[PDB]
Design a protein around this nucleic acid. Structure first.
Ligand SMILES: Nc1ncnc2c1ncn2[C@@]12C[C@H](O)[C@@H](COP(=O)(O)OP(=O)(O)OP(=O)(O)O)[C@@H]1C2
Ligand SMILES: [Ca+2]
Ligand SMILES: [Ca+2]
Ligand SMILES: [Ca+2]
Ligand SMILES: [Ca+2]
Ligand SMILES: [Ca+2]
Length: 341
DNA sequence: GGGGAAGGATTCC
DNA sequence: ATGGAATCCTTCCCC
């Protein structure tokens, strides 16, 4: 089994450059403005320029401006990046019938049957780099290995504009030499949990009682890490089927008043329903981020599919339930549909 | 013991 | 100190 994984590079920033070559060689920052005040909000992606100087996703815009007050600041245009993504996604279907589109900027293929060894795989990776660059002038990063996991890692090693195979020789090395928090699916929380069990490498999960591991990180997380460690992770490249759809917006000022939050919830419903795209949900959820950024949700499932007037009048009832069952204020409010037909 | 729901929570990008 | 969706975990009723 051979997996080729593609991560487009610095994607929203990169698309903004193609539409406007003037931003070649300039630091570029793409953001989501709150409208809470002047420049309020966060960064979503920056290009390599702005990025090597500290500017990264997740950070407040004003902070990003204290670092590079002379870099370019762009309001994001999700629609645009989306379209470009699809076109590039299509370009990939030439190379395999076996494709997994993971996200707007990421996909896997299963080239096991098009390439004889890892050598032809590399060339293939170069054929696809050449192609996207020819058609859309977009640079991507290719990461080849023998499972979805090491493919992604290979790609994270060579990022950006790079390419990188990880043969079984290097896989075997990485299981005992790679920092365990560079494993996909291991964010800071799980990392500190793993540090406190002395597991700082993928193999260290082979010399610990399962029960003890299952105690710190749970059953499912355990199995996962052990499977890579014994080198038997075989998750097949299957097509993704959207399981849920929603929108969530940041309120200009924080509030507990039902009337003030009401319009935001309603906007979020209008976007979510339009995104549904001839799909009918049985399950609705109202999701709220509190003044201290704790997530609080209330939901409900229906034996039939949800109509938009029902969605309106049930979300008001769930939002009520939140303000009754919690005393914090709210800064973000949204809905999420799921359990389709 | 586990499936289905409802809520929390993590990590993904 | 923004937005998207997927997976799991914990707790509950129910078989
Ligand atoms: N914190 C974030 N908020 C919103 N979007 C985010 C956040 N972190 C990552 N993202 C992205 C940004 C890009 O669209 C996509 C990630 O690719 P990038 O262009 O940032 O480059 P990369 O270094 O992550 O590979 C993903 C949703
Ligand atoms: Ca990227
Ligand atoms: Ca990580
Ligand atoms: Ca909570
Ligand atoms: Ca109360
Ligand atoms: Ca990425």
């Amino acid at each position: 089994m051979i997996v080729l994984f593609v991560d487009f590079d610095y994607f929203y920033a990169q698309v903004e450059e193609v539409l406007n070559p003037s931003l070649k060689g300039k630091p570029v920052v793409v953001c989501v403005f709150s409208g809470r005040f002047e420049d309020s909000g966060a960064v979503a992606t920056a290009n390599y320029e702005a990025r090597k100087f500290g500017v990264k996703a997740g950070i407040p815009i004003v902070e990003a401006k204290k670092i590079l007050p002379n870099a370019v600041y762009l309001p994001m245009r999700k629609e645009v990046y989306q379209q470009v993504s699809s076109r590039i996604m299509n370009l990939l279907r030439e190379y395999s019938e076996k494709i997994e589109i993971a996200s707007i900027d990421e996909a896997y293929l299963d080239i096991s049957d098009k390439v004889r060894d890892y050598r032809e795989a590399y060339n293939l990776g170069l054929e696809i780099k050449n192609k996207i660059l020819e058609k859309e002038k977009i640079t991507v990063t290719v990461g080849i290995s023998k499972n979805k996991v090491f493919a992604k890692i290979a790609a994270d090693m060579a990022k950006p504009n790079g390419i990188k195979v990880i043969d079984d020789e290097e896989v075997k090395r990485l299981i005992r030499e790679l920092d365990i928090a560079d494993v996909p699916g291991i964010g800071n929380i799980t990392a500190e949990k793993l540090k406190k069990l002395g597991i700082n490498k993928l193999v260290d999960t082979l010399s610990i009682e399962f029960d003890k591991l299952k105690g710190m990180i749970g059953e499912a997380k355990a199995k996962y890490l052990i499977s890579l460690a014994r080198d038997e992770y075989n998750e097949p490249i299957r097509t993704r089927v959207r399981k849920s759809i929603g929108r969530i917006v940041t309120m200009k000022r924080n509030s507990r008043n039902l009337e003030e939050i009401k319009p935001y919830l309603f906007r979020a419903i209008e976007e979510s329903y339009y995104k549904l795209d001839k799909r009918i949900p049985k399950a609705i959820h109202v999701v709220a981020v509190t003044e201290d950024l704790d997530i609080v949700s209330r939901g409900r499932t229906f034996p039939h599919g949800i109509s938009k007037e029902t969605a309106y009048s049930e979300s008001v009832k769930l939002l009520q339930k939140i303000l009754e069952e919690d005393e914090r204020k709210i800064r973000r409010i949204g809905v999420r549909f799921s359990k389709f037909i």
